[PDB]
Design a protein around this ligand. Structure first.
Ligand code: HEA
Ligand code: HEA
Ligand code: DMU
Ligand code: DMU
Ligand code: DMU
Ligand code: DMU
Ligand code: DMU
Ligand code: DMU
Ligand code: TRD
Ligand code: TRD
Ligand code: TRD
Ligand code: TRD
Ligand code: TRD
Ligand code: TRD
Ligand code: CYN
Ligand code: CA
Ligand code: CU1
Ligand code: CU1
Ligand code: CU1
Ligand code: MG
Lengths: 256, 535
């Protein structure tokens, strides 16, 4: 499987999109980015021009105006127009994001200090997922020869340290996955950047997110609410596979 | 020289707050240097569990030299303690005490023609509550805390159940520290409001009060509403921890998300409380060095009032991923976009003030122009974050860290430096050397941009907040960010040298007004320093 959902060295952009929701985030952000880069360049050029043009050596007698109604009207309305426009594209995207559709696959995720527990209620599958290199796999949250060996054995490399877990959440491609998220002890937060999803795992609450993965591969997230000493050490691995490979994985878990 | 601390005069209290804020500021900046040392490269090299087996002093010095990864058992608790310490010191014990307690106490009475604050004895008490709170915050660092170590690794906002389950009593000391801060701020606000309303000079109508005095007045109202709410939030944590309540514990029927609503109801106002006095300072400085009166005085006052009011109805945009319904998310998104208008507009007014003026590029003016740039860069990323669908990706990443360091942290800091260079002659009778002021500005300006701009890239690439260590792919921009922090720190050490030089052997100030005619508020009609008893 191709490692897709990961940070890349020296990266400045988003992680690759692997869901329609992530795609909408990339587009909306790209749209707002153009606008805010314009605002920033505009304000910067204005400051720099003003300082050159009205420097005391060049403009020896200062003006005294404190008003310009047409300008004050223009500079109030224009911001309002910009925000209404952003909100016009932004609200539908939010609605798509937060309206939970009918699930093809249901996973219940529970955050613990410091690991994730996964349950597939339709399949009677449950398991826990620890960082490769956590005390659970014999390590102590640092790279070592033993840890590199375990990463390799699991189908990864030294570069996936802090991201790769001993077990992955496996799902079929092009299917609607609904994830139900809660926390067992403190608040954690479950996320996969490539899917455009994030949901706090609050003890006593069950919250829902959805994604539909549009290509197969390996996608990582990391716990996104400070939860104690090993907050930095409880990541998320999702493997998106064919329907048949997903079935095969399901059968591997079936006890006869 | 211990009749300094028992003084009740607003000018002496102002000076104590400024010096104390600067010293706490140095401690908290030092934490960020240590933080950026650990973040400079992937793998943990400094915060090793092995350093715990030494003494407190021996452990300290060992932890400043890097170890091979094979010899360094990562200690996540230390990271969490440092960043919590950094955030709490800055938000409660540094910038507000410097701006509100320092410049607020010193200059607001001078700006409105008041001889002193309404309750001078209460003003002195507010200072000592600040100091006691600071001491408790610092003590908490060395108190039995989480994971059988010292200190609270819980984040500056103290989210339960993490904060309520942290072992030891370090967290209870931290909560007491914040109670004392809040009390200091409330006493301050009571003084500022009473003085502003009752003790103005004859002729000094409300539409004639200088903008800085207005900024302090609006800030004071925000404190009176916001700080009692915080006091409730954290007492509820203290009772969950010590007195059997279950406000935020599901086993007893509580909801951790309730704490978040109460905390952030204080927490948003808090950031406007920080930056509002800097707005006041920027207005005075720009008018002075542009040699031109402030553009739209009344719109500036009304914008500040509007921001102050609207700042109470936006809190939950800090909670977009906490489990808010679609309706709640949509409302808070709308409200957040609204408050953005009068906020961002002020940038245009400050540019218009410069426009057609006669600009002198002295040190204070440089800080003010830097402020305009940084506040814009920080403000625009706020715009991105307001859109709840995009915040889904950015929330709890370094993109948020970049946002608030630009818009708030550096905004407050550039306001502080603008004020110090502007006013140090007036306060001390000694003038700073101009070439050093400018060198300080450029080192800080370059360093701050190198520190925080790359954190946008880290955030976009999905780097989470509050992490001791990170996947190797985040290495490049963490390295650059850390170099920027080291340069900024060098600039701050240079600054402290500049202040020391200025106060011991700086050029004697001889004029009441050593700037120009367009510094037209009342402190400039007094001597430098002003008489023990003014007006
Ligand atoms: C100085 C204090 C300050 C200010 C003024 C702002 C300004 C803004 N902030 Fe910020 N913010 C913080 C301090 C501040 N922020 C802090 C401390 C945090 C996080 C705390 C923590 O978690 O620890 C935070 C986090 C934060 C979040 C939560 C992010 C997350 O945790 O996921 C959000 C989301 O809505 C947000 C939005 C905004 C917006 C829309 C603005 C806008 O008001 C900005 C206004 C815009 C500009 C200044 C741009 C320039 C504009 C013009 C020149 C013209 C106007 C044009 C238009 C409006 C189009 N901020
Ligand atoms: C005003 C508030 C403020 C200020 C000034 C700063 C200053 C700095 N901050 Fe801070 N920061 C916070 C508020 C602030 N921070 C908060 C609230 C958090 C969140 C904590 C949490 O996670 O719970 C945070 C978190 C935070 C992080 C993320 C930690 C994590 O997620 O793990 C980082 C990362 O590098 C960082 C770095 C820095 C650096 C390098 C500086 C500086 O070194 C930048 C350089 C600036 C200077 C050298 C100037 C210093 C001058 C003063 C402070 C004024 C002193 C007073 C007088 C002179 C009178 N900060
Ligand atoms: C959103 C972008 C923000 C950027 C802000 C910077 C732009 C500021 C431009 C100000 O424009 C000036 O305003 C003056 C006042 O309105 C005008 O003076 C006019 O009006 C004065 C009376 O107020 C008279 O004294 C003058 O003779 C007469 O020229 C002047 O022509 C005009 O150029
Ligand atoms: O105002 C809201 O605007 C939404 C659009 O921003 C509408 O959502 C409508 O349009 C969205 C388009 O993305 C869909 O996701 C929703 O299902 C659909 O109800 C919604 O009805 C309407 O009250
Ligand atoms: C004016 C203010 C100044 C503030 C102080 C700034 C001092 C910072 C210097 C830190 O020294 C570096 O630390 C790295 C660790 O981050 C080491 O990385 C190297 O050594 C490590 C083992 O110690 C390895 O794990 C790394 O991968 C490898 O690159 C590197 O050798 C060492 O020189
Ligand atoms: C670390 C941040 C430093 C902030 C800078 C504060 C500068 C203010 C110093 C003022 O000290 C004054 O010194 C005068 C004699 O020189 C005294 O007469 C006066 O009573 C005292 O108030
Ligand atoms: C850990 C902290 C890091 C510290 C790094 C800072 C390095 C300081 C550089 C010192 O060099 C200074 O340069 C000034 C600028 O040239 C000189 O001022 C001289 O030049 C000025 C003109 O630029 C004049 O105004 C002055 O009167 C005249 O003394 C000054 O004498 C000289 O010592
Ligand atoms: C880690 C801490 C780093 C240390 C930071 C220290 C920064 C403060 C240094 C101030 O430097 C002084 O600046 C003066 C003002 O510019 C110079 O006066 C010089 O210039 C004056 C103005 O022309 C003359 O009248 C003087 O005689 C002439 O000495 C003076 O020489 C120079 O030393
Ligand atoms: C391929 C996308 C790369 C975009 C990187 C630029 C992001 C910088 C965001 C900061 C905005 C401040 C104006
Ligand atoms: C359709 C979105 C409107 C939000 C803009 C508020 C200003
Ligand atoms: C082989 C060891 C490499 C040397 C690195 C020097 C670290 C300097 C840290 C000093 C920072 C003190 C604040
Ligand atoms: C955004 C910061 C703007 C600062 C502009 C400084 C202009 C260069 C000054 C050259 C020295 C002449 C006095
Ligand atoms: C009055 C003398 C002017 C001093 C200006 C100092 C410019 C130094 C810029 C250095 C950049 C720091 C990284
Ligand atoms: C690719 C842009 C580099 C930005 C460096 C920080 C300023
Ligand atoms: C900003 N909140
Ligand atoms: Ca490191
Ligand atoms: Cu976690
Ligand atoms: Cu976590
Ligand atoms: Cu806020
Ligand atoms: Mg969060």
């Amino acid at each position: 499987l191709e490692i897709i959902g990961r940070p890349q060295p020296g990266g400045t952009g988003f992680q690759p999109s692997a869901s329609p929701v992530a795609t909408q985030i990339h587009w909306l952000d790209g749209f707002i980015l153009v606008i805010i880069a314009a605002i920033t360049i505009f304000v910067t050029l204005l400051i720099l021009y003003a300082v050159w043009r009205f420097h005391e050596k060049r403009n020896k007698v200062p003006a005294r105006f404190t008003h310009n109604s047409p300008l004050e009207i223009a500079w109030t309305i224009v911001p309002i127009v910009i925000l209404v426009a952003i909100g016009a594209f932004s609200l539908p995207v939010l609605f798509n994001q937060q309206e939970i559709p009918e699930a093809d696959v249901t996973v219940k995720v529970t955050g613990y200090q410091w690991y994730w527990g996964y349950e597939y209620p339709d399949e009677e599958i449950s398991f826990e997922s620890y960082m490769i290199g956590s005390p659970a796999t014999g390590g102590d949250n640092r790279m070592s020869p033993e840890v590199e060996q375990q990463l390799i054995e699991a189908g990864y490399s030294r570069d996936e340290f802090l991201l790769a877990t001993d077990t992955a959440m496996v799902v079929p491609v092009n299917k609607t996955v609904v994830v139900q998220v809660t926390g067992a002890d403190v608040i954690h937060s479950w996320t996969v950047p490539a899917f455009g999803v994030k949901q706090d795992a609050v003890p006593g609450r069950l919250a829902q997110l959805w994604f539909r993965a549009e290509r197969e591969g390996i996608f990582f997230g990391q716990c996104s609410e400070l939860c104690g000493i090993s907050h930095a050490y409880m990541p998320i691995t999702v493997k998106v596979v064919s329907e048949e490979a997903y079935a095969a994985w399901l059968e591997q878990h079936h006890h006869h | 020289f211990t009749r300094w601390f028992m003084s009740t005069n607003h000018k002496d209290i102002g000076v104590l707050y400024l010096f104390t804020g600067g010293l706490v500021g140095l401690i908290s900046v030092a934490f960020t240097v240590y933080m950026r040392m650990e973040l400079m490269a992937p793998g943990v090299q400094f915060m090793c569990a092995e350093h715990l087996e030494s003494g407190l002093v021996k452990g300290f010095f060992q932890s400043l030299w890097p170890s091979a990864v094979e010899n360094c058992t990562p200690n996540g608790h230390l990271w969490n303690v440092m960043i919590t310490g950094h955030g709490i010191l800055m938000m409660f014990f540094v910038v507000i005490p410097a701006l509100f307690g320092g410049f607020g106490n010193y200059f607001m009475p001078l700006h409105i023609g008041a001889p002193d604050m309404a309750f001078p004895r209460m003003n002195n008490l507010s200072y000592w509550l600040y100091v006691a709170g600071t001491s408790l915050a610092v003590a908490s660092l060395f108190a039995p805390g989480g994971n059988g170590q010292l200190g609270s690794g819980i984040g500056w906002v103290l989210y339960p159940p993490l904060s309520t389950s942290e072992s030891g009593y370090s967290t209870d000391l931290a909560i007491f520290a914040v109670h004392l801060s809040g009390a200091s701020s409330i006493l301050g606000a009571i003084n500022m409001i009473t003085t502003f309303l009752n003790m103005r000079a004859p002729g000094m109508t409300m539409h004639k009060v200088p903008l800085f005095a207005w900024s302090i007045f609006v800030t004071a109202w925000l404190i009176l509403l916001a700080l009692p709410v915080l006091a409730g939030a954290i007492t509820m944590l203290l009772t969950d921890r010590n007195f059997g309540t279950t406000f935020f514990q599901p086993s007893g029927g509580g909801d951790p998300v309730l704490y978040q609503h109460i905390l952030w109801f204080f927490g948003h106002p808090e950031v406007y409380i920080i930056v509002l006095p800097a707005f006041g300072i920027v207005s005075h400085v720009i008018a002075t060095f542009a040699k031109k009166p402030i553009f739209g005085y009344l719109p500036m006052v009304y914008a500040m009032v509007a921001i102050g009011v609207l700042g109470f109805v936006v809190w939950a945009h800090h909670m977009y991923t906490a489990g808010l319904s679609l309706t709640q998310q949509s409302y808070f998104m709308m409200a957040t976009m609204v408050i953005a208008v009068p906020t961002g507009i002020k940038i245009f007014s400050w540019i218009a003030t410069m426009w057609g003026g006669s600009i002198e590029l002295k040190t204070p003016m440089l800080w003010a122009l830097g402020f305009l740039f940084l506040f814009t860069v920080g403000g625009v990323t706020g715009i991105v974050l307001s859109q709840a669908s995009v915040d889904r990706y950015y929330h709890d990443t370094y993109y948020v860290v970049a946002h608030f360091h630009y818009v708030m942290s550096l905004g407050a800091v550039f306001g502080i430096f603008a004020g110090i260079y502007f006013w140090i002659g007036k306060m001390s009778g000694r003038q700073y050397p101009e070439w050093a002021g400018k060198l300080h500005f450029w080192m800080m300006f370059v360093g701050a941009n190198l520190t925080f701009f790359p954190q946008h890239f880290l955030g976009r690439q999905g780097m989470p907040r509050r992490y001791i260590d990170y996947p190797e792919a985040f290495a490049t921009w963490n390295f650059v960010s850390s170099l920027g922090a080291f340069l900024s720190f060098a600039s701050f050490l240079f600054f402290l040298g500049v202040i020391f030089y200025t106060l011991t052997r700086g050029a004697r100030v001889t004029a009441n007004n050593y700037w120009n005619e367009h510094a037209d508020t009342l402190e400039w009609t007094l001597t430098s320093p002003p008489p023990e008893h003014t007006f």
